[PDB]
Design a protein around this ligand. Sequence first.
Ligand code: SF4
Lengths: 87, 76
Amino acid sequence: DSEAVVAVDAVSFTLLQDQLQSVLDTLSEREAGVVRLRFGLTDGQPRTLDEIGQVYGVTRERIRQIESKTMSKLRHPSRSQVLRDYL
Amino acid sequence: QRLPVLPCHVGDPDLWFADTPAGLEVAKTLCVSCPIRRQCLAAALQRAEPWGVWGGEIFDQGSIVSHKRPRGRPRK
Ligand code: SF4
């Protein structure tokens, strides 16, 4: 059955979600909410840039600048090693 | 492996983006003993990182500044 649950990818996916929740929780609240709403980690629905800007009360260029800075912060190795081994 | 010897992720990661010129100075010089300064600095220069300490050097949005300019009137 070449399309079954491989029983180690499921537990690896659960540990990946746990580690991603940890690394996202070690940030600022506004940046973490922006990243979650941008990549759809809340409820599986990705949100638009103007939608995040509307619900957080700032402009879209401010939102995308905060997103770029937060993506740099996550790309930094100090936060990035424990997720670098997963991929 | 050599992970606890790696000076990037030894301590708190929020230090390396502190917005004071004197706070990040020990963060920049703490990568003096880093074993992977060449590849880290090379990746940081090629992918144009806009923030924080990278390869034992600070970064603006595109390039390398020597020391970050403090808040206030600069010295004549
Ligand atoms: S910024 Fe410097 S000290 Fe930090 S991981 Fe990269 S090379 Fe090592």
